[PDB]
Design a protein around this ligand. Structure first.
Ligand SMILES: C[S@@+](CC[C@H](N)C(=O)[O-])C[C@H]1O[C@@H](n2cnc3c(N)ncnc32)[C@H](O)[C@@H]1O
Length: 1218
């Protein structure tokens, strides 16, 4: 069958049917305004008509006004449009299979694509349906022009004809419902055509279509009610799916068919059950147990099955099929089985009056596929939809009932007449029943009813059937009103051999006010979501040896918020079989939003029982099915007693055995170590910084050059562990938080009313030595060491211990694939909090691992401290070897050192993993050894460039970041941030203050530092303090005028590698200059994560003047000096050559004069752009803008409007063009 047709039609069909009811209700007068307030205006009385229509069609009219005032105008239309659609859908299905007694098609015409067969056989069709109006209808057909009048009469006559067998869908007292039937049913634009035209006939063969009609009708109102709280009337929309047939079979066959096969093991139904999971080999003790409960025989018509949420009845249809083959096998006549199944075996509930309308239809269409006279028998269907009790005239009906026959009939009977036999066990049983179904359109089948009231209700019910059949008008009007409630109560008091359902799914963030309190007070173990309450309630609906079988979300197997429930299941019930599906089990939902599992749980507790699991998480819907059938991916080694060894007690069949026997033999991790969540500052943008953004004087960072005692009164910034990226031993020392005055600002940080926004937690553990981890990590789990002088927030959780060895032995553990083996178990998410991480095992201490971890952390710390983004940065790693050697040879010397360390840490990490795996007695096959690509070091090209698979292009890209990093360090020495003479960071505080002292102290005597802190970054050599100029002065001052040219050609060779595009004949010197003016800005953006310490003042898009400015060295007089000594003298040289280039264009010709014009044209564009960058720099230079370094980089960079480059990529806001 092709759903793609129904999926497109049914949503459109819903709304279609709805406007046709509004348009007919507007005539009917029942109407609401835009605000949902109802309007009557009563009804005109033009003699014997009600103009807006007959006046016998008034009373009936005045019962819509009644019901609409009882529910909701929106509701009315949403229901009645559905009922008719369900009716017409029921007719369409039934006319294709020729189920009609008159044997003519009703909605279509076989030999005419546009017509209606009931129109040409008016005499025959009328003879069957309306024998009295035959002379009239044969007269209107002979008028040939009243077909819409005629067809409106036969079609209404057909639905009436179907009320005898299907009273739940085709009601007969629907009087008002006839006034809402649309006209023009006989036109090419009737609503009817889409129902026929949108669905080919082959889609109608099988019955599942009923469920796809079901699922796509309401699909649209679903997309409007998701994410929000769901109204009591929107529930059927928001929770309505459709189970694949292969899951239902697995559910029905492993519950119903299980019990039958449990008594008659050599039943040929086992071959007829493809999804029947055979029982695993039990211990002799359980083997004695199960035989003691299985009855020696089961009679077929003693089995009773319940779907509490049938929906389309898709599950009942399969129960019907499983029961069908049980009756055949027992020796029962063919025709007699449907009645016995639908009356003695199949019972179903739901809240959507219109979902039952389809479900019962579906069972009757399966029954009509087997017995032609099931439509002649009084077949009571136990498929009912739940009804509220806020609209009953209870005192009016119990006196209309005359159950004990109190009114001797005939005594014409007063507004104070004491309700007689209010003490009768039919009244007290009736009132207790009407009190249980108050908000039935909200609770559904979760309402329990005591089994003790079973007998009294059925005897009351059958009597309510009798008196519906033998009684007078009041007793038949009355006893017809009470049956829906006495029946639905009778279904709830009854217990069943198997409950099969695909329950509804709704987390505790769409439940409405009414529903929530019902969960806290009645289902505390499973108050989180609906599907769980159905799981725990369904057990209250089974016999002792009964089977609960559902297909549920998987979260009840893991989330600690179900621990009380998971604890409850293991103690009282017996898991039988479970097929864990995971995602994409339903081939018609989109997104990884739905993860499921189907299971069967006996209502008896057996300890030593051996259940069978199927891990079918992979593939589309088709695959799990194929692997389920082929019995791929089977687990049958763990009893339900074994799953109690895991903190929280997760259903965790995927576990093996030595990992289960290690939770019991060893001690918990977060027990030993104080897993503490950090503060929550409330605002990470106000309080947290990158350490390079602020003055090093104003940080708790102990510099290698400030022996002056850190005055803890001037200290504003303290290094803060704030989450970050994966890392296995030490990095991420990048965030500093504002902790001045012991956090006076974070502590008093309040909202508007007075409540406190931040959440300073565990501030006793601050500045301690400990570890840390990304609380949130996409990949594996990893921890890093954390020295003293740090704080930490909630994004960077930290464990602490008093023993440094345990602090390392833990840090060595929490980084293995072994830990990521457990964290899969306790909580398969990306959240690595302090609660599941605390339940991790943790064995005795070995002294070997503590050295391997000390070596590993210093390998990792040496790795981290090597970049200029770290505070502990000393100098560029090239400057560790002799300064006579050739530069290309020093590159080679450094790479070989960087591969040995990867192997060492890899051999260390794998030695650590292999030691833990030996102690916990684990399986090295499950825990793979660490690979070189996972060694979390920045010198490992495999890890830094995960995306590049090559070796050459991997090696080249490595040489390339190596050549850029040495350029940003030289640009660093130009500004004054580092120095050859002095180890470590040199100058980094506000206002260019104290820089000059350093110069007088020969802080930069080897390589001089730029005077003003303005470096022109240009593509041709104008100034002498140009960047590309001083770089050569650097290489010359370091490696030798001897080597200058090959070291420079090798730099040219290496920039060209990945950084920029080479050019033939381009000197080493030109090659370098090109990079700096164009690409360096971007790499420095990336290098500092869009937080530049060197600011590129840019004239504009012609790159007429670009200069770098070091952030710390900035003062008021800079933009005045920037204009005095750079922007002013440069606009003078541009002119003395536009004039010299015009002395040559007139003195040249041919190919050279066209070359001097493009050199004069290009030079004049850079003269107008730097003329308006001067008109705009003079603007910002007068302002004497003086910065504050504590403010941040995203703020100051907007203070200059568009003078700087990438103002909208750094600040976010487009540059404010002053
Ligand atoms: C049961 S599943 C759909 C049934 C479908 N035949 C299948 O294969 O699963 C979702 C349906 O459950 C229905 N349902 C039944 N009983 C319910 C209850 N007590 N509360 C809410 N929804 C309920 C909802 O109306 C919704 O349409």
């Amino acid at each position: 069958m092709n759903t793609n047709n129904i999926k497109k039609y049914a949503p459109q069909a819903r709304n279609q049917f709805r406007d046709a009811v509004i348009q007919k209700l507007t005539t009917l007068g029942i109407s609401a305004d835009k605000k949902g307030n109802l309007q009557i205006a009563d009804a005109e009385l033009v003699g014997e008509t009600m103009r807006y229509y007959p006046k016998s069609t008034l009373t009936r009219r005045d019962r819509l006004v009644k019901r609409a005032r009882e529910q909701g105008f929106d509701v009315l239309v949403e229901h009645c449009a559905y009922t008719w659609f369900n009716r017409l859908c029921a007719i369409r299905y039934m006319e294709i299979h020729g189920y009609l007694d008159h044997g003519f098609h009703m909605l279509s015409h076989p030999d005419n694509p546009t017509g209606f067969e009931v129109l040409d056989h008016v005499p025959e069709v009328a003879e069957a349906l309306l024998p009295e109006k035959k002379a009239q209808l044969v007269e209107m057909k002979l008028s040939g022009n009243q077909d819409e009048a005629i067809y409106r009469e036969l079609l209404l006559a057909q639905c009436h004809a179907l009320h005898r067998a299907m009273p739940f869908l085709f009601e007969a007292v629907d009087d008002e419902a006839e006034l809402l039937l649309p006209d023009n049913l006989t036109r090419t634009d009737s609503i009817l055509r889409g129902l026929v035209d949108g669905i080919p006939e082959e889609d109608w063969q099988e019955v599942e279509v009923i469920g796809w009609l079901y699922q796509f009708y309401i699909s649209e109102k679903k997309d409007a009610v998701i994410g929000k709280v769901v109204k009591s009337e929107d529930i059927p929309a928001a929770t309505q799916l459709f189970t694949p047939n292969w899951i239902v079979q697995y559910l029905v066959q492993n519950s119903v068919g299980r019990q039958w096969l449990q008594t008659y093991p050599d039943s040929p139904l086992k071959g007829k059950m493809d999804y029947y999971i055979e029982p695993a080999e039990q211990t002799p003790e359980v083997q004695a147990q199960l035989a003691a409960i299985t009855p020696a025989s089961i009679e077929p018509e003693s089995i009773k099955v319940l779907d509490p949420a049938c929906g389309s009845g898709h599950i009942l249809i399969e129960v019907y099929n499983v029961l069908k083959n049980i009756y055949e096998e027992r020796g029962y006549r063919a025709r007699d089985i449907p009645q016995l199944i639908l009356e003695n075996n199949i019972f179903g509930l739901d809240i959507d009056d219109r979902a039952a309308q389809l479900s019962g239809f579906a069972l009757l269409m399966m029954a009509r596929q087997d017995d032609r006279r099931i439509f002649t028998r009084d077949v009571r269907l136990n498929i009912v939809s739940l009804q509220e009790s806020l609209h009953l005239d209870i005192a009016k009906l119990w006196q209309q009932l005359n159950f004990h026959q109190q009114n001797q009939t005939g005594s014409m009977g007063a507004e104070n007449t004491a309700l007689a036999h209010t003490d009768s066990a039919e009244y007290q049983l009736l009132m207790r029943t009407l009190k249980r179904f108050v908000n039935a359109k909200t609770l559904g089948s979760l309402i329990q009813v005591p089994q003790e009231e079973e007998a009294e209700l059925k005897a009351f019910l059958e009597a309510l059937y009798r008196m519906e059949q033998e009684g007078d008008f009041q007793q038949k009007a009355a006893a017809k009103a009470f049956i829906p409630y006495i029946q639905q109560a009778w279904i709830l008091a009854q217990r069943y051999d198997a409950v099969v359902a695909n329950p509804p799914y709704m987390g505790g963030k769409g439940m409405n006010s009414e529903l929530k309190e019902f969960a806290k007070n009645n289902f505390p173990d499973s108050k989180a979501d609906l599907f769980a309450m159905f799981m725990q309630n369904a057990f209250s609906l089974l016999k002792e040896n009964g089977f609960n079988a559902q297909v549920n979300m998987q979260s009840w197997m893991f989330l600690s918020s179900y621990e009380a429930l998971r604890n409850w299941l293991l103690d009282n019930k017996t898991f039988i079989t479970m097929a864990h599906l995971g995602a994409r089990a339903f081939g018609q939902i989109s997104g990884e939003v739905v993860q499921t599992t189907a299971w069967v749980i006996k209502n008896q507790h057996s300890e030593r029982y051996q259940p069978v699991f199927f891990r079918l998480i992979d593939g589309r819907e088709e695959v799990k099915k194929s692997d389920l059938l082929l019995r791929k991916n089977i687990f049958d080694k763990f009893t339900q007693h074994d799953f109690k060894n895991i903190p929280g007690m997760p259903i965790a069949y995927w576990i093996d055995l030595p990992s289960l026997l290690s939770f019991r033999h060893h001690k918990k991790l977060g027990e030993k170590i104080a897993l503490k969540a950090g503060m929550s500052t409330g605002d990470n943008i106000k309080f947290q910084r990158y350490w390079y953004e602020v003055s090093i004087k104003k940080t708790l960072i102990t510099n290698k050059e400030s022996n002056t005692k850190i005055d803890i009164h001037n200290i504003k910034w303290f290094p803060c562990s704030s989450g970050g990226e994966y890392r296995k031993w030490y990095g991420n020392n990048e965030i500093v938080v504002n902790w001045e005055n012991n956090g006076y600002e974070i502590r008093n940080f309040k909202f508007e009313n007075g409540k406190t926004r931040s959440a300073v937690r565990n501030d006793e553990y601050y500045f301690r030595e400990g570890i840390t981890w990304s609380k949130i990590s996409q990949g594996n789990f990893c921890v890093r060491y954390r020295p003293k002088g740090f704080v930490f927030d909630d994004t960077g959780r930290c464990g602490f211990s008093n023993n440094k060895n345990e602090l390392l032995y833990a840090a060595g553990l929490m980084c293995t694939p072994v830990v990521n083996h457990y964290l899969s178990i306790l909580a398969p998410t990306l959240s690595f909090t302090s609660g599941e991480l605390a339940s991790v095992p943790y064995p005795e201490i070995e002294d070997e691992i503590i050295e391997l971890v000390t070596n590993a952390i210093e390998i990792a710390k040496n790795d981290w401290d090597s970049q200029e983004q770290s505070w502990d940065y000393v100098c560029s790693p090239l400057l560790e070897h002799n300064s006579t050697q050739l530069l290309r040879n020093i590159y080679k010397q450094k790479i070989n050192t960087n591969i040995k360390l990867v192997e060492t840490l890899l051999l260390i990490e794998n030695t650590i993993n292999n030691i833990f795996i030996d102690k916990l007695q684990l399986d090295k096959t499950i825990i793979k050894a660490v690979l070189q690509s996972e060694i979390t070091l920045l010198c490992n090209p495999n890890y830094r460039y995960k995306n590049i698979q090559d070796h050459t292009d991997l090696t080249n890209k490595y040489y390339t970041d190596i050549t850029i990093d040495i350029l940003s360090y030289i640009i660093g020495c130009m500004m004054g941030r580092y120095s050859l003479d002095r180890e470590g960071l040199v100058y980094a505080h506000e206002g260019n203050k104290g820089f000059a002292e350093l110069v007088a102290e020969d802080a930069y005597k080897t390589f001089p530092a730029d005077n003003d802190g303005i470096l022109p970054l240009m593509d041709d050599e104008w100034f002498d303090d140009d960047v590309t100029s001083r770089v050569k002065e650097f290489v010359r001052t370091v490696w030798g005028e001897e080597h200058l040219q090959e070291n420079l050609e090798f730099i040219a060779e290496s920039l060209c590698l990945y950084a920029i595009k080479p050019k033939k004949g381009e000197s080493a010197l030109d090659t370098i200059r090109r990079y700096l003016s164009t690409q360096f800005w971007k790499d420095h953006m990336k290098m500092y994560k869009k937080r530049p310490i060197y600011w590129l003042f840019s004239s504009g898009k012609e790159k007429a003047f670009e200069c770098l400015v070091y952030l710390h060295r900035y003062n008021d007089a800079t933009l005045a000096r920037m204009r005095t000594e750079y922007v002013v003298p440069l606009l003078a040289r541009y002119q003395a050559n536009i004039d010299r280039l015009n002395e040559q264009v007139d003195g040249a010709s041919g190919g050279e004069a066209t070359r001097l014009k493009r050199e004069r044209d290009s030079l004049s564009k850079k003269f107008n752009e730097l003329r308006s960058f001067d008109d705009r720099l003079r603007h910002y230079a007068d302002m004497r803008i003086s910065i504050d370094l504590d403010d941040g980089v995203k703020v100051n960079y907007g203070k200059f409007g568009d003078l700087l480059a990438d103002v909208k990529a750094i600040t976010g806001n487009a540059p404010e063009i002053i």
